[PDB]
Design a protein around this ligand. Sequence first.
Ligand code: AGS
Ligand code: AGS
Ligand code: AGS
Ligand code: MG
Ligand code: MG
Ligand code: MG
Lengths: 256, 330, 318, 497
Amino acid sequence: SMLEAKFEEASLFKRIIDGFKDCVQLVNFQCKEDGIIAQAVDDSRVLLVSLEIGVEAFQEYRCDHPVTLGMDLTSLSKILRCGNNTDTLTLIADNTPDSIILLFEDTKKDRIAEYSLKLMDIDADFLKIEELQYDSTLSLPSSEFSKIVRDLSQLSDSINIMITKETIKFVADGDIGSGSVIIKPFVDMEHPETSIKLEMDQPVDLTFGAKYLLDIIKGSSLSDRVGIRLSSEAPALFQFDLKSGFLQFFLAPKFN
Amino acid sequence: EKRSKENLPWVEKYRPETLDEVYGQNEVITTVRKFVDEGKLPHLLFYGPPGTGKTSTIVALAREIYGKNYSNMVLELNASDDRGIDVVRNQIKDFASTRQIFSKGFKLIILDEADAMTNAAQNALRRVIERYTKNTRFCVLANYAHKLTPALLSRCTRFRFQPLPQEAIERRIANVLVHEKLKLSPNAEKALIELSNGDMRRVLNVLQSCKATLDNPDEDEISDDVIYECCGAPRPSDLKAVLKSILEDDWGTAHYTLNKVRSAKGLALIDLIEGIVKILEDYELQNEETRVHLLTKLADIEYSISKGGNDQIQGSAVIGAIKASFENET
Amino acid sequence: TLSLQLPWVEKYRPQVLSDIVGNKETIDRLQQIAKDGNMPHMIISGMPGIGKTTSVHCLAHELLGRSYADGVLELNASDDRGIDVVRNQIKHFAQKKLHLPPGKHKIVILDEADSMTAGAQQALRRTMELYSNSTRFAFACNQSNKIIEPLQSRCAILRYSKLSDEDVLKRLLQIIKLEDVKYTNDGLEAIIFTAEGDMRQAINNLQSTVAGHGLVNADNVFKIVDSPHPLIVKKMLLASNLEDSIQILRTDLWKKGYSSIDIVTTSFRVTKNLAQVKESVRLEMIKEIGLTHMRILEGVGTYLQLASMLAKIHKLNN
Amino acid sequence: VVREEDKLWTVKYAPTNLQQVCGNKGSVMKLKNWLANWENSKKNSFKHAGKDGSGVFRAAMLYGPPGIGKTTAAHLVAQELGYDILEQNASDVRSKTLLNAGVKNALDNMSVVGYFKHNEEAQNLNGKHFVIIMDEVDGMSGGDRGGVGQLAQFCRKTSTPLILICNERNLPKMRPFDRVCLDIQFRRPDANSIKSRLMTIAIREKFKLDPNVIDRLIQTTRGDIRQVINLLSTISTTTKTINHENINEISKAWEKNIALKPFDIAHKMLDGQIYSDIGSRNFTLNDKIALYFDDFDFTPLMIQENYLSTRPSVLKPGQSHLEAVAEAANCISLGDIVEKKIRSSEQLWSLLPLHAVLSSVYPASKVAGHMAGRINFTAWLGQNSKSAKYYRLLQEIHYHTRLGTSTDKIGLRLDYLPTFRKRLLDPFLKQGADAISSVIEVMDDYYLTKEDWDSIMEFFVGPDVTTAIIKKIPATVKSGFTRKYNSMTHPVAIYRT
DNA sequence: CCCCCCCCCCTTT
DNA sequence: AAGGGGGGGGGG
DNA sequence: CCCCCCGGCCCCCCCGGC
DNA sequence: TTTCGGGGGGGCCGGGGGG
Ligand SMILES: Nc1ncnc2c1ncn2[C@@H]1O[C@H](COP(=O)(O)OP(=O)(O)OP(O)(O)=S)[C@@H](O)[C@H]1O
Ligand SMILES: Nc1ncnc2c1ncn2[C@@H]1O[C@H](COP(=O)(O)OP(=O)(O)OP(O)(O)=S)[C@@H](O)[C@H]1O
Ligand SMILES: Nc1ncnc2c1ncn2[C@@H]1O[C@H](COP(=O)(O)OP(=O)(O)OP(O)(O)=S)[C@@H](O)[C@H]1O
Ligand SMILES: [Mg+2]
Ligand SMILES: [Mg+2]
Ligand SMILES: [Mg+2]
């Protein structure tokens, strides 16, 4: 088996999958000697999910040659639900692969559950996510962003984010009036996790859909803070760090 | 059931329990017996008219194959149960694709009265029959072949149940008279066979009614008079007299004779028409037009009677039709 | 007694494309496709028991070798084939990734596809189009008109014709040799005559004989197999005199147990397919037969009604 | 990774450029012009229509028979103008809920894939836009509830170009798309427009194809290029020469069976040629019954509608047109009785063939010939609906006046209504506005209303038609009548009707 | 720009 | 070989 | 104590010949 | 158009289980 990646507990992989399972259907995983990079595009072709998991997140990682695996997330989640969170989860794939093996092993009861998931043929090529000089680079706690987004979505289906000098406005102008939430760059020493920073280059103003933001903010469980990179005319970048790796959402802004 | 078999109707009390008690179908019985005795039973399609022994034959075959516990080793479905496409997809498929519970053996499925099943279910049954032929066999019973899809008919070996021959009916009547302490005259047996039209149910029901009619069945013999009284059917002499009067007397005399013959025993006009048609079938007419007119007008009168209407007008119509048709002989 | 024996129809089901008789051009085309691969989307149509399912299965087996288990998705009327099934399971199978030799593809076999609803057929279109590089579709049906035009446009039409008497005789003789069956020429003639081009019925009757009487002669065949009643009805309708028609009706149909509804329906069909009689005369006879059929459906299923129908038909043909 | 010789010929030889498309050049040009100028129309809010008239529609509806290049044309147009394609088809659930939760968000959103693919591309302004292609809209079965209406709203309200594709534009289900999209029609391409493509395919695949028999092949597939390419691929496996010798057999084997529509069924059934001896030999009675079954709910209506408008060529010696018409009418009446039997509680659908003979085939054979004029659709459906509406109105009027009269609804129609008119309409034509009160009184005596007044006035026929009479009444009189009625209380016969 | 075949497609709940 | 309307090859 | 999964009615629509 | 019956497919509702 060229590819053998062991997660000490299946909980981590389950949380990672659940983070971006309500917005995409098919994922392409490229596994190389340096780890796993996964890409996904939603049906509407508006949201792009990228995932990076380094070799530090696995107890034992071995990859003789790079491999590509197309997975449907419904089946993957269904199979993952069959393994307890306290078992070690081994992902196994051999040369010329038609399926991937998920092995949930528990040494406490010497119980081994082996599942085989058939791979999907995806012809889409990995979009080149080249570094972009985003105009604004904000970062704020995941809980606060989730609360604000969920509160604003109840009023309007579109949320407008404006970044100006020491001003971050989330307007929700829609059918139910027009509510706004304003936060300022704030720093605390007792609990630095609740600090808000702003590193603009030019003023920014982008409008996004409510459904995409609601799907994106579902990943707050995997990170304590969320980093938002914005540019005058380009997709936003919502980054959630992990113990070893990251989960990024690229959302195409609404027109004007 | 309740109490004992003596409380059952004769049509049910005398239901064959073994293939040796099925009369009048010697070829089919022999073929099926040879098939079972050599382990080469194919899918069966028993096609026949009412009361010929199809259900009895298949039940006896299942009993012979599986013994007394056959009821728990076969899947019997009839028009009284739901047999939709979902039933075929789930219940029949599960039965055909699973092993026996009580004892080892092959699976038998009896789709009695399969002519009452929808076309969709019949189509779904095709691959069920084809795929599980190794361990399952299907038997379907029908009275009307036009209701069965060609695909289903292609998959089944056909056995036709003819109307019961007269000798088989006599043998069954002899067995019944041996069981029930009864005496039957040859004329009574002849009339019973004539009116039965090859149906054993009719024979048994009429015999039971005849026995009930006798005052002292132990020492009273059933005669043709008893049969005609219980069945309320015209006697041959009455039909001959009516026909002779119609064909050889004036209109008033024919009307009077028909009315008197009908009133004497309270006969129905339809039975008289049937008897006269049977009598005239053997007549040798010199002109085809006479037969054509007879058949057409009598069929019209029978159809009119089927919907009710005035009885006297219908009788006069019968008389006039016969007279006009026979006027063409010249 | 409790151990069944495989019927000859299944025991001698052709396992290779070279064992199928009839439709020589189409069979050779299928053999060429198997040899060179690149199977196209196809629809095989015909009438019962001519070798459609056998041909499709043989082609799939020969093409896919040992990859038959994973590369073939078989669905028929006995399986649920609704719109949801087509959208989910068939789409997943088409999107599946499987490693096969250079000239092979995954195969979806929709047997009895005429039973599928219009919505499922509509849903199949873009699935067939987008994934043709890895999946191919083979439909087998009895009535091609049931398949919607868009699906027919995407497939290759293979309309099987009925097996000739020679092909039926050839296959029957091969089976006889492989089974060591005693037979006479007249017995084979009777078997083929009653088969009416249906291989399944021919083999079934051949087994029923021997299984019941040993020697396959015309007599023994006719003691179990009845001559097709459509031919008897045709003889009844074409009889010169009304007396002959009535005699045929009484002896060959009524006294044999055939129901009146069956007789009248067969009369309708035969009159519809009487090419030797003028169309107007056939229309008048059909009107009379329809009157009789309507009377029968009401409950008056008597021999007198059929006799009257024959009398009216003879009146028309005079 | 996919070998060239392992693809279907329809994929290997699929058009790569809009010029490679065969036939329907005008439709392709119309679609290209519509999409090219879509941005300008958006800038003008789709108010100033151009010379072509395509500037007012924000969406296009491509329709035509199968296998002619609609999907290929739409995809090539989308890719030629550097747009990003968002495609949905009948293989995707397209109900109201899913459409609202799906393509609706993308209707006014940018394309992340487009941005990340054309970031380095210069002068690609459309690369970040979406072109929504809704294929197989006609194939929306019960699995897509409300999809047609939601797509119609999308067409009437969208921010990016939207293209819809269907095969049957004349079906009632497609009515909502009547005037909310630019209709682009694709016609069966002729043989001359595809002969070069067939020659190229034959040369590339190493098999002889005679140019003469190409038209016969096109006729066999009825202008389906996909079907003809498939036929060539299937026949070339064993036959290396499609010449005049084998053309007949190939055409007869692959000939299509398209169910005729009601007008075509009526035209063919009434043709006198098929009922001749020879024509009977070619077109048989079974063929006629199958032609009826092609549409068994409209064929009898069409025959009954059009059997009086022909010039028979099958008249028997001495038989006149009127006698044949009478015989056909008698058989149509018998067929109507049979139809009543079929759709009764017994559900005797086994009589469907017999009905076919009594309602369609026999009368047509009696009056078969050449149509004397245009074939007309049945007028029975509209008349039936009108009769049902009038019967409903009569029932309401009867039950409003049921407490004053002594009769059934038929007696009310035949006897009471004339006197009611004489007491409700004539007074207005003699004393003008002085009858108002009197008329109202009459209404109050029978629990009548203004709507009942109009309905009653709408029943009379022949020399008692009130339309002109009502129209000629002075407007002042009618206004006064309405004001007087609306300014007074009236009794109610039935509460909560 | 105009005109003429030549055929196709639509009438239709 | 139904009547009426629309479109693309050829002549003008 | 509250939320989510997925079995069962409930409703609506469309054929029904060879 | 439509007098039953069957079949398919979608929308709710609610029992039960899980956290
Ligand atoms: N060949 C027979 N031999 C003896 N009794 C018979 C025979 N046929 C019918 N009967 C008698 O009539 C009764 C009914 O026979 P069945 O087997 O039910 O006939 P059937 O043909 O299956 O009826 P249908 O086709 O459903 S109306 C039996 O219980 C017997 O008593
Ligand atoms: N051309 C044939 N050659 C040899 N045997 C045949 C042939 N056709 C049919 N049979 C035999 O009959 C049996 C059934 O054949 P099938 O392939 O099932 O016919 P079919 O046309 O597919 O039936 P339908 O259309 O679903 S009713 C086979 O197992 C064969 O034994
Ligand atoms: N005008 C054409 N020219 C060349 N090839 C064509 C043309 N039209 C269809 N084809 C061929 O047929 C194949 C499929 O055609 P499509 O455009 O996808 O079908 P369609 O016209 O959309 O009809 P439906 O409604 O999908 S059946 C193309 O890839 C081509 O290979
Ligand atoms: Mg029975
Ligand atoms: Mg088959
Ligand atoms: Mg298409």
